[PDB]
Design a protein around this ligand. Structure first.
Ligand SMILES: C[C@@H](C(=O)N1CCOCC1)N1CC[C@H](NS(=O)(=O)/C=C/c2ccc(Cl)cc2)C1=O
Ligand SMILES: [Ca+2]
Ligand SMILES: [Mg+2]
Lengths: 53, 234
Protein backbone atom coordinates (compact mmCIF):
# COMPACT_ATOMS: atom_id res chain seq x y z
CA UNK A 1 0.00 0.00 0.00
CA UNK A 2 1.69 3.16 -1.31
CA UNK A 3 0.55 6.77 -1.90
CA UNK A 4 -3.23 6.90 -2.68
CA UNK A 5 -3.78 3.29 -1.59
CA UNK A 6 -2.35 4.09 1.89
CA UNK A 7 -5.28 5.73 3.76
CA UNK A 8 -6.27 7.80 0.66
CA UNK A 9 -2.86 9.57 0.72
CA UNK A 10 -4.08 11.63 3.77
CA UNK A 11 -6.51 13.48 1.37
CA UNK A 12 -10.00 14.61 2.49
CA UNK A 13 -11.52 13.80 -0.93
CA UNK A 14 -9.98 12.96 -4.35
CA UNK A 15 -6.47 11.44 -4.44
CA UNK A 16 -4.31 10.95 -7.52
CA UNK A 17 -0.69 9.92 -8.09
CA UNK A 18 1.62 12.02 -10.29
CA UNK A 19 5.33 11.23 -10.77
CA UNK A 20 5.57 9.11 -7.58
CA UNK A 21 3.73 11.73 -5.47
CA UNK A 22 0.20 12.17 -4.00
CA UNK A 23 -1.88 15.12 -5.33
CA UNK A 24 -5.16 15.85 -3.43
CA UNK A 25 -8.24 17.62 -4.89
CA UNK A 26 -11.87 18.44 -3.99
CA UNK A 27 -15.43 18.29 -5.43
CA UNK A 28 -16.98 21.35 -7.09
CA UNK A 29 -17.90 23.92 -4.42
CA UNK A 30 -14.89 23.15 -2.16
CA UNK A 31 -11.36 24.63 -2.28
CA UNK A 32 -8.13 22.86 -1.34
CA UNK A 33 -6.74 24.21 1.97
CA UNK A 34 -3.19 25.63 2.48
CA UNK A 35 -1.98 22.17 3.64
CA UNK A 36 -2.95 20.79 0.20
CA UNK A 37 -5.03 17.99 1.80
CA UNK A 38 -8.24 19.29 3.45
CA UNK A 39 -11.29 20.49 1.48
CA UNK A 40 -13.04 23.75 2.57
CA UNK A 41 -16.65 24.66 1.54
CA UNK A 42 -16.77 27.92 -0.47
CA UNK A 43 -20.40 28.72 0.42
CA UNK A 44 -23.51 27.67 2.39
CA UNK A 45 -25.09 24.19 1.77
CA UNK A 46 -22.01 22.61 0.08
CA UNK A 47 -22.51 19.27 -1.76
CA UNK A 48 -22.47 15.99 0.17
CA UNK A 49 -23.29 17.37 3.66
CA UNK A 50 -26.33 16.45 5.76
CA UNK A 51 -28.02 19.74 6.76
CA UNK A 52 -27.99 21.02 10.39
CA UNK A 53 -29.75 23.90 12.28
CA UNK B 1 -37.54 0.71 0.41
CA UNK B 2 -38.03 -2.75 2.02
CA UNK B 3 -36.68 -2.63 5.59
CA UNK B 4 -34.19 0.09 6.62
CA UNK B 5 -35.11 3.21 8.60
CA UNK B 6 -36.63 6.68 8.32
CA UNK B 7 -34.45 9.49 7.05
CA UNK B 8 -34.26 11.75 10.07
CA UNK B 9 -34.26 15.57 9.90
CA UNK B 10 -31.54 16.75 7.44
CA UNK B 11 -30.15 13.24 6.74
CA UNK B 12 -31.26 12.72 3.12
CA UNK B 13 -31.32 16.31 1.70
CA UNK B 14 -30.44 15.32 -1.91
CA UNK B 15 -33.63 13.27 -2.37
CA UNK B 16 -36.07 14.36 -5.11
CA UNK B 17 -39.47 12.80 -6.02
CA UNK B 18 -41.02 12.82 -9.50
CA UNK B 19 -44.76 13.46 -9.11
CA UNK B 20 -47.60 12.95 -11.61
CA UNK B 21 -50.75 15.07 -12.38
CA UNK B 22 -52.50 13.49 -9.37
CA UNK B 23 -49.63 14.73 -7.18
CA UNK B 24 -48.43 11.14 -6.58
CA UNK B 25 -44.80 10.01 -6.61
CA UNK B 26 -43.82 7.37 -9.18
CA UNK B 27 -39.96 7.66 -9.23
CA UNK B 28 -37.07 9.24 -7.28
CA UNK B 29 -34.16 11.52 -8.32
CA UNK B 30 -30.92 13.04 -6.93
CA UNK B 31 -30.31 16.78 -6.55
CA UNK B 32 -26.99 17.56 -8.34
CA UNK B 33 -27.12 21.40 -8.34
CA UNK B 34 -29.64 24.28 -8.16
CA UNK B 35 -30.82 23.53 -11.75
CA UNK B 36 -30.23 19.74 -12.21
CA UNK B 37 -31.81 16.45 -11.09
CA UNK B 38 -30.36 12.97 -11.85
CA UNK B 39 -32.88 10.15 -12.57
CA UNK B 40 -33.50 6.90 -14.52
CA UNK B 41 -34.27 7.01 -18.28
CA UNK B 42 -36.96 4.33 -17.89
CA UNK B 43 -38.83 6.58 -15.46
CA UNK B 44 -39.63 8.98 -18.33
CA UNK B 45 -42.20 6.58 -19.82
CA UNK B 46 -44.31 6.39 -16.63
CA UNK B 47 -46.27 9.69 -16.97
CA UNK B 48 -47.15 12.26 -19.66
CA UNK B 49 -46.56 15.33 -17.51
CA UNK B 50 -44.61 15.43 -14.25
CA UNK B 51 -42.97 17.73 -11.72
CA UNK B 52 -40.16 17.46 -9.15
CA UNK B 53 -40.63 17.75 -5.36
CA UNK B 54 -37.78 18.37 -2.87
CA UNK B 55 -37.45 18.92 0.94
CA UNK B 56 -40.19 16.40 1.84
CA UNK B 57 -39.94 13.54 4.41
CA UNK B 58 -43.64 12.96 5.23
CA UNK B 59 -46.19 13.11 2.37
CA UNK B 60 -49.10 13.53 4.85
CA UNK B 61 -48.00 16.74 6.66
CA UNK B 62 -46.60 20.19 5.76
CA UNK B 63 -43.13 20.28 7.33
CA UNK B 64 -42.36 23.72 5.87
CA UNK B 65 -39.38 22.81 3.66
CA UNK B 66 -41.26 21.39 0.61
CA UNK B 67 -40.81 22.91 -2.86
CA UNK B 68 -42.33 21.84 -6.20
CA UNK B 69 -40.36 22.61 -9.43
CA UNK B 70 -41.34 22.48 -13.09
CA UNK B 71 -39.13 20.75 -15.65
CA UNK B 72 -37.77 22.84 -18.53
CA UNK B 73 -35.67 20.21 -20.42
CA UNK B 74 -35.53 16.39 -20.32
CA UNK B 75 -32.09 14.94 -21.23
CA UNK B 76 -32.37 11.15 -21.79
CA UNK B 77 -29.30 9.03 -22.81
CA UNK B 78 -29.64 8.32 -26.53
CA UNK B 79 -28.38 4.72 -26.15
CA UNK B 80 -31.00 3.75 -23.50
CA UNK B 81 -32.96 0.57 -24.37
CA UNK B 82 -36.10 -0.90 -22.74
CA UNK B 83 -35.04 -4.46 -23.57
CA UNK B 84 -32.18 -4.59 -21.05
CA UNK B 85 -32.33 -1.20 -19.26
CA UNK B 86 -28.82 -0.52 -20.55
CA UNK B 87 -27.86 3.21 -20.37
CA UNK B 88 -30.64 3.81 -17.77
CA UNK B 89 -29.83 7.47 -17.00
CA UNK B 90 -31.40 10.90 -17.51
CA UNK B 91 -30.76 14.49 -16.40
CA UNK B 92 -33.54 17.09 -15.82
CA UNK B 93 -33.03 20.89 -16.01
CA UNK B 94 -35.54 22.81 -13.87
CA UNK B 95 -37.40 26.01 -14.88
CA UNK B 96 -36.57 27.70 -11.51
CA UNK B 97 -33.49 27.14 -9.28
CA UNK B 98 -33.68 25.11 -6.09
CA UNK B 99 -33.16 27.24 -2.96
CA UNK B 100 -31.01 25.08 -0.63
CA UNK B 101 -32.04 24.90 3.09
CA UNK B 102 -32.77 22.33 5.83
CA UNK B 103 -33.56 19.04 3.99
CA UNK B 104 -32.63 20.47 0.54
CA UNK B 105 -28.97 20.13 -0.60
CA UNK B 106 -26.97 18.53 -3.42
CA UNK B 107 -24.91 15.32 -3.34
CA UNK B 108 -21.32 15.48 -4.74
CA UNK B 109 -20.29 14.09 -8.11
CA UNK B 110 -17.01 12.12 -7.67
CA UNK B 111 -14.13 11.70 -10.20
CA UNK B 112 -14.20 8.28 -11.98
CA UNK B 113 -10.89 6.56 -11.03
CA UNK B 114 -11.03 7.62 -7.35
CA UNK B 115 -14.72 6.57 -6.99
CA UNK B 116 -14.12 3.13 -8.57
CA UNK B 117 -10.96 2.41 -6.56
CA UNK B 118 -12.06 4.00 -3.26
CA UNK B 119 -15.86 4.50 -2.97
CA UNK B 120 -17.06 1.37 -4.80
CA UNK B 121 -14.62 -0.73 -2.73
CA UNK B 122 -16.15 0.42 0.62
CA UNK B 123 -18.40 -2.13 2.40
CA UNK B 124 -21.71 -0.36 1.73
CA UNK B 125 -23.67 2.36 -0.01
CA UNK B 126 -26.94 4.08 0.98
CA UNK B 127 -30.14 3.89 -1.08
CA UNK B 128 -33.27 6.01 -0.36
CA UNK B 129 -36.91 6.68 -1.43
CA UNK B 130 -40.72 6.76 -0.96
CA UNK B 131 -41.19 3.43 -2.82
CA UNK B 132 -43.02 0.24 -1.78
CA UNK B 133 -42.29 -1.12 1.70
CA UNK B 134 -42.57 -4.74 0.41
CA UNK B 135 -42.94 -6.36 -3.02
CA UNK B 136 -46.77 -6.23 -3.03
CA UNK B 137 -47.28 -3.44 -0.49
CA UNK B 138 -48.25 0.22 -0.69
CA UNK B 139 -45.91 3.17 -1.21
CA UNK B 140 -44.31 4.71 1.85
CA UNK B 141 -45.62 8.06 3.12
CA UNK B 142 -42.25 8.45 4.86
CA UNK B 143 -38.86 8.89 3.21
CA UNK B 144 -36.67 5.86 3.96
CA UNK B 145 -32.96 5.06 3.60
CA UNK B 146 -31.09 1.72 3.79
CA UNK B 147 -27.43 0.58 3.92
CA UNK B 148 -26.75 -1.84 1.05
CA UNK B 149 -23.51 -3.83 0.77
CA UNK B 150 -21.64 -3.76 -2.54
CA UNK B 151 -22.01 -7.19 -4.15
CA UNK B 152 -19.26 -9.13 -5.95
CA UNK B 153 -19.78 -8.67 -9.71
CA UNK B 154 -19.33 -12.39 -10.60
CA UNK B 155 -21.82 -13.55 -7.93
CA UNK B 156 -24.29 -11.00 -9.16
CA UNK B 157 -24.01 -12.20 -12.77
CA UNK B 158 -24.49 -15.82 -11.64
CA UNK B 159 -27.69 -14.88 -9.75
CA UNK B 160 -29.34 -12.94 -12.62
CA UNK B 161 -31.80 -14.13 -15.28
CA UNK B 162 -31.25 -10.90 -17.22
CA UNK B 163 -28.01 -9.45 -18.61
CA UNK B 164 -25.72 -7.27 -16.42
CA UNK B 165 -23.96 -4.80 -18.74
CA UNK B 166 -20.80 -2.74 -18.18
CA UNK B 167 -23.24 0.09 -17.25
CA UNK B 168 -24.70 -1.65 -14.17
CA UNK B 169 -23.62 -2.86 -10.72
CA UNK B 170 -25.22 -4.89 -7.93
CA UNK B 171 -25.96 -4.11 -4.27
CA UNK B 172 -28.05 -5.58 -1.44
CA UNK B 173 -28.51 -8.96 0.23
CA UNK B 174 -28.74 -12.61 -0.78
CA UNK B 175 -31.48 -13.52 1.75
CA UNK B 176 -31.83 -10.76 4.38
CA UNK B 177 -35.16 -8.86 3.97
CA UNK B 178 -33.85 -5.45 2.81
CA UNK B 179 -33.89 -3.89 -0.68
CA UNK B 180 -35.16 -0.99 -2.79
CA UNK B 181 -38.50 -1.53 -4.59
CA UNK B 182 -41.04 -0.10 -7.07
CA UNK B 183 -41.36 3.67 -6.64
CA UNK B 184 -37.67 4.06 -5.64
CA UNK B 185 -36.40 3.81 -9.27
CA UNK B 186 -34.49 6.89 -10.43
CA UNK B 187 -33.46 7.57 -6.77
CA UNK B 188 -30.05 8.08 -5.08
CA UNK B 189 -27.42 5.47 -4.31
CA UNK B 190 -24.72 7.38 -2.38
CA UNK B 191 -21.40 6.42 -0.70
CA UNK B 192 -20.08 8.11 2.45
CA UNK B 193 -16.35 9.01 2.77
CA UNK B 194 -15.14 11.15 5.72
CA UNK B 195 -18.68 12.48 6.43
CA UNK B 196 -19.18 13.54 2.77
CA UNK B 197 -21.73 11.80 0.50
CA UNK B 198 -20.95 11.13 -3.20
CA UNK B 199 -23.36 9.93 -5.91
CA UNK B 200 -22.42 6.35 -6.85
CA UNK B 201 -25.59 4.92 -8.48
CA UNK B 202 -29.16 5.30 -9.71
CA UNK B 203 -31.93 2.88 -8.51
CA UNK B 204 -32.61 0.87 -11.72
CA UNK B 205 -34.21 -2.60 -11.54
CA UNK B 206 -34.56 -5.97 -9.82
CA UNK B 207 -36.37 -9.31 -10.13
CA UNK B 208 -39.03 -8.35 -7.56
CA UNK B 209 -37.97 -6.83 -4.25
CA UNK B 210 -35.74 -8.47 -1.60
CA UNK B 211 -36.02 -12.03 -3.03
CA UNK B 212 -33.76 -14.90 -1.88
CA UNK B 213 -30.81 -15.20 -4.25
CA UNK B 214 -31.56 -11.86 -6.00
CA UNK B 215 -29.91 -8.37 -5.67
CA UNK B 216 -30.81 -4.75 -6.54
CA UNK B 217 -29.38 -3.51 -9.83
CA UNK B 218 -28.13 0.12 -10.15
CA UNK B 219 -26.93 2.30 -13.04
CA UNK B 220 -23.11 2.68 -12.68
CA UNK B 221 -22.83 6.48 -12.39
CA UNK B 222 -18.98 6.42 -12.59
CA UNK B 223 -19.29 5.28 -16.25
CA UNK B 224 -21.42 8.37 -17.06
CA UNK B 225 -19.51 11.28 -15.42
CA UNK B 226 -18.38 12.95 -18.67
CA UNK B 227 -21.92 12.48 -20.03
CA UNK B 228 -23.41 14.09 -16.91
CA UNK B 229 -20.89 16.97 -17.19
CA UNK B 230 -21.93 17.68 -20.80
CA UNK B 231 -25.66 17.47 -20.06
CA UNK B 232 -25.26 20.01 -17.22
CA UNK B 233 -23.75 22.62 -19.58
CA UNK B 234 -26.41 22.48 -22.32
C1 LIG C 1 -36.31 -7.75 -14.29
C2 LIG C 1 -36.91 -6.35 -14.30
C3 LIG C 1 -37.40 -5.97 -15.70
O1 LIG C 1 -38.56 -6.16 -16.02
N1 LIG C 1 -36.51 -5.44 -16.57
C4 LIG C 1 -36.90 -5.02 -17.93
C5 LIG C 1 -35.88 -5.50 -18.93
O2 LIG C 1 -34.56 -5.08 -18.58
C6 LIG C 1 -34.20 -5.63 -17.32
C7 LIG C 1 -35.11 -5.14 -16.23
N2 LIG C 1 -38.01 -6.21 -13.33
C8 LIG C 1 -39.00 -7.27 -13.03
C9 LIG C 1 -40.12 -6.51 -12.34
C10 LIG C 1 -39.34 -5.41 -11.60
N3 LIG C 1 -40.13 -4.22 -11.28
S1 LIG C 1 -40.19 -3.68 -9.75
O3 LIG C 1 -41.21 -2.67 -9.72
O4 LIG C 1 -40.30 -4.83 -8.91
C11 LIG C 1 -38.64 -2.90 -9.40
C12 LIG C 1 -37.94 -3.24 -8.32
C13 LIG C 1 -36.57 -2.82 -8.00
C14 LIG C 1 -35.85 -3.53 -7.03
C15 LIG C 1 -34.55 -3.16 -6.69
C16 LIG C 1 -33.97 -2.09 -7.32
CL1 LIG C 1 -32.34 -1.63 -6.89
C17 LIG C 1 -34.64 -1.37 -8.28
C18 LIG C 1 -35.94 -1.73 -8.62
C19 LIG C 1 -38.17 -5.13 -12.53
O5 LIG C 1 -37.48 -4.12 -12.55
CA1 LIG D 1 -44.50 16.92 3.80
MG1 LIG E 1 -31.88 -10.93 -2.16
Amino acid sequence: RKLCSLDNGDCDQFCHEEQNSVVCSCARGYTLADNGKACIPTGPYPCGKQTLE
Amino acid sequence: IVGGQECKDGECPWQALLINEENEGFCGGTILSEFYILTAAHCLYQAKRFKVRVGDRNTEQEEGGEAVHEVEVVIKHNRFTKETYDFDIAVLRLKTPITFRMNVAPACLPERDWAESTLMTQKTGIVSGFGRTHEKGRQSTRLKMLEVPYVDRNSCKLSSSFIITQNMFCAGYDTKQEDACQGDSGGPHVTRFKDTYFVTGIVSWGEGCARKGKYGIYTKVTAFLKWIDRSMKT
